[PDB]
DNA sequence: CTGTTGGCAAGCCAGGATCTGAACAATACCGTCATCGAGC
DNA sequence: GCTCGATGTTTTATTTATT
RNA sequence: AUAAACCGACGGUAUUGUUCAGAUCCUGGCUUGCCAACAGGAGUUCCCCGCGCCAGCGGGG
């Protein structure tokens, strides 16, 4: 299959983890009923900015990529456009063997001979070319040592990019996050007491805040960030995949964090290949009720919902699930995971 | 389908003197359903049907505050609670937000306080409705009246 | 490691300890049942102005907004070192707001000052004006090196633990903290149904009857407190402290975060209670055991018992699944087994 | 040390020493069970109207909020030594109210009141008039002082030791106090279902049947006391008393928590009962040993035998757990000195632990 | 995890008279532990598991109050409702039952079935005997005076 | 090896009044238009 | 390559109910 | 690869101090649990063994 689907279920201690422009809670109306949400947005940065996304993505081995091993297929691919004289003096200037290229270096590529040729018809050079296309040099090559976070997450809100080829969507997909259950939000009444006021306070304001068990859905397209890492292998893929796959079951957001304090796991896991991503989010279309708490009944929920549609939804094809919980599992078809490492592991070997 | 409040106001009114000292010495709603008087007085009023039970569980605590302290008084849509309460001029304002903002069996107490302190004269239906939903909304809305009265 | 995970469950007789608006008990709704609520607000202030906080760390910060009654103040406790002058115009550049003679001068917020960040700021101030360095460049200069101030900070652990923001004044581009502990709210393990305390007030001028009627919310309750501190930002936050200094803070954070309760209501509920469990664990990324209670505890020969049990297991789940093995250490009394909270603090005292 | 604990564990006779508006008794729900409850103000009030403290320590407050009939008191007791004018005066600067000749005036809530302290007030008010001194500025110039305030406060210690609030008047400034001594509720270490008394009130000039028809809830119980006392604080509110003073008020606290039991329905259930077991604590911080029964002491040999049990096991595991220390005295009727007698317990506490 | 009512029911009405004959003779539940067809009776239902065996202890001393008495209906009525049908027990009896303290109570309800001889559903009555508390005694009064005072 | 049956389970009458339900002080700030040319 | 500062423009609608 | 793509609403904060629910009160009068009854019937006990009149007796299990 192509795509790796990425289900969580993960329980929070009360808290605000993403609010709007009045300090309020996000929610989304599902079901008829208003959820708790924490934006798509918040959740991917929450990804993209943590250490270990650094660490295992930032800091990769595909990280870095050579302008010089890609010279002979952008030496064809710009060849029908642009002539090798001004390929070859593009590619050196950037700089100062390879099967495929990723589509934004072409693209970005194909700019700068567009410059450099204008910069020969009207007859220029020197540090006149070089300090009309300074900052753009320095941008793509920025770009060029970030291969791997522009391949998965796309290009960054400042990228330099400059062609419709560099408009480079992430490979993953993140939905927003949205509770199984129905939420009237808490509201935390607080004074700011002033060391040098005799009576009463110096502020009084109110928080809104709020537990609840989220559904986290991600999804990842393979071939796309095969293609986006130049060609590279589907097993690379599948660690990157396993790396989403961590990030999407450990990192929270870090808003209202200090205070609050709901750093929590997540207590489910779980991830199946397919042919069309699907976000199982409809198994809470009815709010779960609560049974002991809103977890083991959202569990619950999520594997009925499963074991009723996923043989119809075409969702046949590799699927694990680690977890915490003892609740009663899903059909056999699913495999079960002890440990997310063995999860991980799971998605190494193509499942 | 709906209950008869006034004829559950009227029941209430001519109950024997026993029966009506049973109900009155409950000291929580669920209570009531430890007293054979209590399901002797509800049981024409769809008791043996529990939607009702829950409502007249409310209702029939509130009375049981005293055969005289809820006056009826008919419409001329009809004096609220919220606006009885105010009209008592013995409520304060904090205790209005102290009942609207409690949880089960607590708000049920502090309201069977509430009129004891101001024996209101309101439309009994009125409030028989109001405690036979009693969501959120409602407890706003009695907050809101006994604002907006005073 | 650099995350210092405390975990404390902690026991509390019948009391009101966190009250709100129409004082009431402060709550939360977690795992569709009503929990009693300690807001952190309350834990952090009760810590910072305790005996043990005044022995142990030193003087608390002046959160203030009343920058006329500062003025005041700073002019009583500078004087002896700086001429009036320099002090005004250093609160007036600190907090971006003229300071005069006004009977009545507000900032724009209540904001935490430490006295003796103040006074380095001034020690600049006058080696500014005396250069002939005007104001703005005096910004720059400052901007260039912050690590000074945050040594100031060190005369004021609080903020560097629980963080600082400034919207106006010179404090905007230098007094900007992050905190660098975290914590959350505490919250009870299982389900309360608050009870309600019907008292009066009796007059001796008045025969008949009391002089009040009224009504207390209160309750008993196992509450979960937790806490990390964040180890590296504390380092910074104090000016380039070295890891002993953190951790020492970090240990006097445990024995705080496992003795101290707020005073509310205590001088006629008396709560004060200790904490009958201490958990403390190294790791990598922040862990919060909340979900261990997310079922509520159900009761079985006390609250308090079940609630360690449940907490053990959630522990040793999420221990397994996520394979986490830092450093850990419990102290019980119903990872590690302590006899005693002070070897807990010692073994944290030294990195575990 | 500078806080003093103490920890008493009495039994009462089956009984009703506290109870609501309902005439049900007063419980908490304390490890998930059921206990029959003492509030604290019904201690502290059967404790300072009592005539052990009459006795020992003084008199009590005049707690009301009846500022006319306080202005009648204090014209007639203070009458031999004050013009009626600045009496009246002194009341009005102290209440933020207007004293005339109404029948009717009413404070904020009902106030501590010690006639020593107004009687005190009363001079500064009078020197005041006769320096021509604004009430401003004469509320300026004591506010720079609390202390002899605090000892007119020596005078009524019963506000010393629980405190005193104030929304309007002088005394928002110059009348607030912080209790010395904390307290809180006395709650059964195990779990209680309250019987019922099903009673009957026999008329004498009728035949058939009774007069009246009622139910009293009622229960005996082993309740757990506690009280500590700040101490400083209460050297501070007696306006710079010293630790011996303090220490003699504690031990009187002590004896009076020891034996002092709430007057309700006790002219029909009579539970008189001392207490079995009284440890105080000295010690450096406040502790309470209320966890100890968290787990509901269940019934062995009746529930005082387990409960002291409890009490002492608990505190073992506490003492040597968070290294505590501090002296720790213990007396009872069956390194924590053990005495035979009360008194000999008292004793000690005066000697401030030793 | 729970025990076969009608089963048992079964059970006690095919048993040999006997047995059944030693069963009844019997003055309290917890004198049925030192009768040997009592466990012979009780065995295929689990008697080895406790909470099942105080169960069974309450459930065998009401069947055992005769084998005609209980007339076994079926859908259902209560042990309040069957009572109350009699029209042989004044409130007070049944208050005498649900205020009765410990093995007392099973009494009071042995002298309530000869007397009453009710005909019922007998699980749901088992499942009442089951978790034999405070609710159970509170619907039974229900049950009671709501199908007397229908009357 | 064998363990029983009938007949019967109550009525009267009674549940209270007094009086009371608080006040004060405090509810923030920043940024998320643009222009031009100058000084640095 | 900027930060600086003066500057193009323009706002006000209310005021007692009852699922 | 969709008014798409890339994409945090962010940072700081005790709700505080004061307070009996209290006085008065039989649950009370009447009531056999009572009549019939042998604990008797019935030698299965599956082996090894020693001595016989072959009927049956013993020691080791």
New interface residues.
Partial sequence: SNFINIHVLI?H??SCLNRDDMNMQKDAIFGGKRRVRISSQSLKRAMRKS??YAQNIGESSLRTIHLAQLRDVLRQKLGERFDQKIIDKTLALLSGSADAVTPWVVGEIAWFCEQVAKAEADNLDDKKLLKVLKEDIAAIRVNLQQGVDIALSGRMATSGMMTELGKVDGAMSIAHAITT?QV?S?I???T??????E?GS??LGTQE???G?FYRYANINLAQLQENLGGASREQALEIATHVVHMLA?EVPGAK?????????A?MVMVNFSDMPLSMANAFEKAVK?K?????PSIQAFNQYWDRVANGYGLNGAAAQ?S?SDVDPITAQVKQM????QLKSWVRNNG | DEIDAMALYRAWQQLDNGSCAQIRRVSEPDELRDIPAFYRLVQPFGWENPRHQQALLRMVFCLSAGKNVIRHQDKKTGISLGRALANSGRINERRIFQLIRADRTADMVQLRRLLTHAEPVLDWPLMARMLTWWGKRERQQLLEDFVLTT
């Avoid at chain 1, 002991?292 to 083991?296: A, C, R």
């Fill in positions: 329980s201690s009360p250490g270990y259950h009237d808490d935390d009444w607080f700011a007491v002033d060391d040098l006021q009576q110096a502020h805040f709020s537990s068990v450990t964090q200090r205070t609050y304090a709901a750093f929590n796991p207590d609560a002991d708490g809103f977890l083991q680690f915490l002890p440990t997310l490492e």
